[PDB]
Design a protein around this ligand. Structure first.
Ligand SMILES: Cc1ccccc1S(N)(=O)=O
Ligand SMILES: Cc1ccccc1S(N)(=O)=O
Ligand SMILES: Cc1ccccc1S(N)(=O)=O
Ligand SMILES: Cc1ccccc1S(N)(=O)=O
Ligand SMILES: Cc1ccccc1S(N)(=O)=O
Ligand SMILES: Cc1ccccc1S(N)(=O)=O
Ligand SMILES: O=C(O)CNC(=O)C(=O)O
Ligand SMILES: O=C(O)CNC(=O)C(=O)O
Ligand code: NI
Ligand code: NI
Ligand SMILES: [Zn+2]
Ligand SMILES: [Zn+2]
Lengths: 323, 323
């Protein structure tokens, strides 16, 4: 079996290899990439997402989210307090202000130490889940707004036609902005391109060990666990790498820089944080191997987790009992 | 000037001409097609939207709308009463039931007579505005889910990058289901493909005469007009061809059949009805010529008209005062 220790793999496709998205995902999996839950793809040097990022300041963040923490430094939840609308230009200025800017630090490791030591004592503002794309329409390869849809994948694999659409989201981040431990809706894949700015650090649990993280989460967030059988779907819980090591949870970490893609694989739990002002674009996608994971995916039914309209059809066809 | 009487033109592109969407729209306008407000495009015989429509019965209509009329036979409003969810298979069966099925009739003209005589005395159920597509992903030409986005058009023309996305909608219709007099959001173009089933009859006012229809509508719906300076944006008002002729409003009519595209042009008011069970797919799009119309488009501010999240950026950039 390939990649038995479930390490995060890094790929450097040639421009020829970069012409067929589906084929390259399948290639990565033939090398065992999916066992980690996360892979990095560095695009060929000839490729570009767009010409420049010079005219993006007028994009609106209609509902910036202030991420307020509760708990202890290595085990906490965050809730999202809605703030008034601001443009990306205004958001960038805020990110770079004395109150919110990245502190002096020696390297990625020093910054990681500072994040887990001090995250809970601040409430950074995140521009998340903004429907849109920054890929040039003329960018024909790995354009996250031009991928085959999950609805068409399900139709190709299972022969059923369903309603729903599948479009990218933009994420504007600043120092300490955080994504909580989660898998994707319906345990789909995701792909994430860091367009511009400071890095994003990722933590990931191998899909074959996801239930170990779930069991620890139930122990560490007992009230939340009693409230919902799938509360990690709420996307509010954080657990530090030190606490993961203390509890024997297998995981890996890697830092994504501007110009790089990350792919998360079905049922690969991930979490992380931004180093400073940045902009990422992400979308869910599927492959034939996803179907079995979609059939088995946990669901939140307590009402907290937001459901997209497109998720309805997934549950209806793949999980009719639970529907 | 081409097409000075503002007639609806019908186009028969060759398979070679069908390879460049933007170029063919520009060609149609060079022949004066836009002056009518509406054009028909019959695709080349070699083209197909998808292989078959055999497996569409499991699509869900989450919120079927019962279209209840008030007023007189030739001048009425309709409101949409929400019904419980049903599949397309269930909807088709309902459409074909004795209560809702198309009556015996001699031709399109006889059916049109019956529609305007009797529409208000029934309340047909419409499956409208369902996000999704029935184009095969392998259909590369005139695939309504693969068009250049309006956001990218605005960026190409004006140099500003904005948030927002632009995806198709499905419409499942039955006898007497009705679309009220309207122009598109931000006076955009629309394109509509009739995938399957019975015809759709369209009425259209030339864009250069749109204000004539507005003035008549203010006279015929006086309470609505007092409530909102752009109440046709509510998409609830119907006026018959007989009443249009009585009031000297220039208009044309045409019937769309399965396998045919219709394009509506900026500020071309249109209305119409379905002949029996059918399924259409539609999406808005833009061209360089649209920008001037978008800048001038009326807006509903009374709160009735539904606004998509994507419309925000259009108003913000093209109409900053009104924003
Ligand atoms: C093969 C190689 C080489 C250097 C770094 C990483 C890899 S990989 N693709 O992560 O196994
Ligand atoms: C950028 C480029 C250039 C030439 C051939 C192929 C590509 S790519 N990497 O497949 O988009
Ligand atoms: C113990 C250790 C050390 C470094 C990285 C990851 C681990 S573990 N085994 O995944 O908890
Ligand atoms: C030229 C032609 C011919 C027959 C019917 C319609 C037309 S058109 N394209 O509507 O002018
Ligand atoms: C269907 C077809 C076939 C051959 C060439 C071009 C086409 S089309 N009409 O441009 O999709
Ligand atoms: C009078 C008439 C007759 C047939 C179609 C259209 C009209 S008109 N002139 O558009 O109101
Ligand atoms: O970038 C973020 O803030 C979170 N992204 C993801 O969880 C993802 O791409 O799957
Ligand atoms: O088909 C309908 O019910 C209404 N369609 C439109 O108004 C359109 O395509 O612009
Ligand atoms: Ni994710
Ligand atoms: Ni319309
Ligand atoms: Zn829940
Ligand atoms: Zn209004």
């Amino acid at each position: 079996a390939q990649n038995p220790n479930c390490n995060i793999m890094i790929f450097h496709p040639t421009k020829e290899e970069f012409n067929d998205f589906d084929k390259y995902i399948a290639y990565m999996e033939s090398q065992g990439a999916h066992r980690a839950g996360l892979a990095k793809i560095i695009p060929p040097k000839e490729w570009k997402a767009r010409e420049t990022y010079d005219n993006i300041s007028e994009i609106l963040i209609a509902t910036p989210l202030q991420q307020v923490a509760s708990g202890r430094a290595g085990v906490f939840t965050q809730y999202h307090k809605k703030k008034k609308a601001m443009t990306v230009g205004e958001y960038r200025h805020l990110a770079n202000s004395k109150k919110y800017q990245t502190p002096p630090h020696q390297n990625f490791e020093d910054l990681e130490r500072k994040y887990w030591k001090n995250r809970i004592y601040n409430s950074p503002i995140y521009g998340a889940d903004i429907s849109g794309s920054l890929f040039d329409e003329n960018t024909k390869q790995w354009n996250l707004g031009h991928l085959g849809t999950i609805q068409d994948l399900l139709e190709k694999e299972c022969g059923v036609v369903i309603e729903g659409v599948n479009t990218p989201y933009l994420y504007f981040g600043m120092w300490k902005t955080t994504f909580a431990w989660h898998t994707e809706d319906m345990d789909l894949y995701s792909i994430n391109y860091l367009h511009l700015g400071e890095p994003k650090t990722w933590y990931v649990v191998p899909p074959e060990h996801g239930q170990r993280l779930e069991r620890l989460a139930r122990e560490l967030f007992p009230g939340s666990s009693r409230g919902c059988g799938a509360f990690l779907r709420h996307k509010v819980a954080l657990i530090s790498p030190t606490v993961l090591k203390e509890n024997g949870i297998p995981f890996n970490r890697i830092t994504q820089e501007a110009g790089e893609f990350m792919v998360t694989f079905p049922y690969g739990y991930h979490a992380g944080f931004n180093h400073g002002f940045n902009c990422a674009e992400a979308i869910n996608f599927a492959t034939p191997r996803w179907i079995d994971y979609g059939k088995m995916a946990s669901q939140c039914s307590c009402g907290e987790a937001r459901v997209t309209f497109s998720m309805d059809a997934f549950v209806r066809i793949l999980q009719p009992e639970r529907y």
